Amino acid sequence: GEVVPYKAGMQRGQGYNTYLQSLCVKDAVTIERHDDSNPPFKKEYYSEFIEEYEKIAKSMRISAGVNVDILNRSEFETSTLTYEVKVLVQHQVSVLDKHSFNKIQTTTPHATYGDRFIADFIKGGHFYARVSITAKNSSETSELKQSATQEVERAVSSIKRNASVKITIIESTGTSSDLLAVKEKADQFYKDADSGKHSYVLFAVLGKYRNLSNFESYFAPFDYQMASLRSWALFNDFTLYKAIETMIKAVPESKFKDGPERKTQLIKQAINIFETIRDRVILISEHPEAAKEDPDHMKPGDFRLEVLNSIQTKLFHAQSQPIPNTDDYWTDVILTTKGSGNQPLFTFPAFDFGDLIGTEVVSFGKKKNGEEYNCLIGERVTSLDDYKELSYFWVFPDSVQKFAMEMYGVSKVPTRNYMRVYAADQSDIENPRPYQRFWFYVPSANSPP
Amino acid sequence: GEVVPYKAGMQRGQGYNTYLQSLCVKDAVTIERHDDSNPPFKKEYYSEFIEEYEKIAKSMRISAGVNVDILNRSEFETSTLTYEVKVLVQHQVSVLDKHSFNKIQTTTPHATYGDRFIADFIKGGHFYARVSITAKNSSETSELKQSATQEVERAVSSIKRNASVKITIIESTGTSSDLLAVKEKADQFYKDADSGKHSYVLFAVLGKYRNLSNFESYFAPFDYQMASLRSWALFNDFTLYKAIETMIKAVPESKFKDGPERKTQLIKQAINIFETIRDRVILISEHPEAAKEDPDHMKPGDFRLEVLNSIQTKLFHAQSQPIPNTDDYWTDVILTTKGSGNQPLFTFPAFDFGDLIGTEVVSFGKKKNGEEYNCLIGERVTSLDDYKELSYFWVFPDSVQKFAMEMYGVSKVPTRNYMRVYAADQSDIENPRPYQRFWFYVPSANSPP
Amino acid sequence: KFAMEMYGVSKVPTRNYMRVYAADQSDIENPRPYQRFWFYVPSANSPP
Amino acid sequence: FGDLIGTEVVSFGKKKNGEEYNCLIGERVTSLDDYKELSYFWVFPDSVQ
């Protein structure tokens, strides 16, 4: 605990609850700048100027000998210029400042002051440029034809058509011939740093209230290093529980098992237990010694299981299409519509809507311009043009505890797009067949409702 | 104890607990700068300007003698310029300053003041430049053909295509023709030092509170030289224990022997004994004479052993593939999948996941574009292109106390990629066979659970 | 419980013979050529 | 093993590109290229009481 990423609203000289990573009382510490001078700084400058692809190819074809003449010319020019710089400036914290501690009013000084204060801000800067000057593609051409009666033919002529200047400039600085223009700003940035105008807040340096001279032990600051280490299993469960609030809200009503009165008490059940872990965290602020007690709240895994159990599913009954000129070899099409003469493989619950994290879609790509069978995970037809979604449905690419244990694997024959989807094994993954795209797990019906 | 690497947040004139290497009260010592002048400095300047690879090769081929003509030209130019400088500036500590000691009222002056204070900061600077100007690769070429009826053919012409300017500049300085531009900054850096603007904090000089004139023996500072020497076996165990906290956290739940209730009490057991050694260190601060007492905490080795004992393993049963045109010679393939006609060699627990420090992976490289058998440790197929993965699994490259005692060695035949992996010996290392890549130890099943 | 009955639009490219029919959820899944749009009309079975 | 002051290593240099037998004290094969290692072991160049 010596640095922390900048968080907007930070005010120099304020408490910082290093465990909760929140912000605390402002102006507890007054820093007097005895000397007005920018701190020492460190500079970097990586620059590239890629070759000048200068290529002139020129033609001169003449033929004469009722006398005829031929005079043909050509001219091809190229010029690819590229540029790139990256300037990094990092300042330091001045060593000639005075730190003091001001007294505030709270019967709970621990929650007001916190643990550590923001002494000085680590400042810096950044630069990033790219110039892409495209070729000229000069195309000077010409033809002539003098037969004897007379004849002239000069209907051949063309000129350059190319000029691309792509410029990207990314800067983080402070207030006080395109290749060359970028260079001057890039070089001026180097020289500008020496003037010490590159004051952009990057990091904050933390200091302990004990080291303050003016601190006469207004309180006993906690040391959260061990408390944070012990209470890590709880911190992760916080992010997971917050994420699964959006699980319930995102999915619509028309795909809940119990119907109307399932959204609210699933939403309320998650938030009610979100309170239990949030107040446990707030309790650790008052009593870091309370980190010993084990959690007394339902696991995110068990509650997540409860979420998926109450979700309707689609019975994607894969069917083996029969194609002529095939013996003991079928064509597996995963379509929900019953077919005639197609052998059904298996009928299983599946997810026909997104908004359920941990799931990805397997959208078959059928050529509208042809008949090729494709199977792309998380890649719809919309990426390409004139293709058809035989079937799209989100699924779990990986297994889950006691829910998604049965397996499905995709295999394709390069010569002929006969979809070969079958119940694969951990060995099909270990030793993959040619053109085997992806494998996915589907929920097991053996789960108890 | 005279110098210490800079630690951000350091404030001139503050206590320093040399044993704990932490920071203590700020502004215990006030340093008055009687004279405003930068201290004497030492400069270095190492410079290289590599040759100018100037190479012109030019062609002039003519042939004439129904009269024909041939006129061929060429031109090849090269110019490789390289540059490099390294400027080091180191200041000194002024000898004409006054040091004083300010009183802070505390019941524990030892833990507040510490042992030594930060008198002056050793300042300096740095420079590092590299210019790589690539060749022009001028390619002037031409051809001509005059047959007698007439004929002209000039369809041969090309121009230079190369211009690379790689610039890297690394600077540590203070606030107040690319080859030549770098030189001016490099030379200006030399001249800039004379003005004494190269004030970058590098080292901190420590002073003893006893030598202060104003010190009337406010306390009796400890001498931690002997205490630190005695308590070194404990300091190492600290870093090891902190490292193995991430051991447990990194590895997932699905590869723990006891399952759910193994992560938390393995995590808690490590942190609980992390407290015991951290408080022992904090106790040495109050009582350095307490360095005599031997440790009363479990060894990192024994606790580490406990970590690996509770880890599931993979039974990589190596099998000898039979290849035609081989007598009494097989092909050992280390694959977990049972094969037909392949002789199994040994079946052993192994680690199929990283996140366990002290382990490295042996990822076979199988040519997807061919059939070559490869065996690269810590080097996957991803480095190359079109290389199927036979087997990858992390292992201990070295032995461990009473866990990893059985050996495996890799040998390969240059003429034919017949993987020759066998139970090697310590002498197989001493005298290695040709193309023998690596040897590794696998856990011994004889360990008592 | 209001709009449950379905209508679907289909058109023949060669001749513009409007082919609008009572489609199904599967007609959406596997659409015929030049089938433009499908829409639901209120069901008279709703109780007033 | 090193780490014992007052000791130096005698690392035989065997040509991997050939068969020459070499014996260099405190000079391993790493200084040169393609030299197999026969034996390396730190020893006292001088006597001790």
UniProtKB/TrEMBL annotation, chain D:
Name recorded for this polypeptide: Aeg-L
Top-level taxonomy: Eukaryota, Fungi, Dikarya, Ascomycota, Pezizomycotina
Covered residues, full protein: 394 to 442 of 490
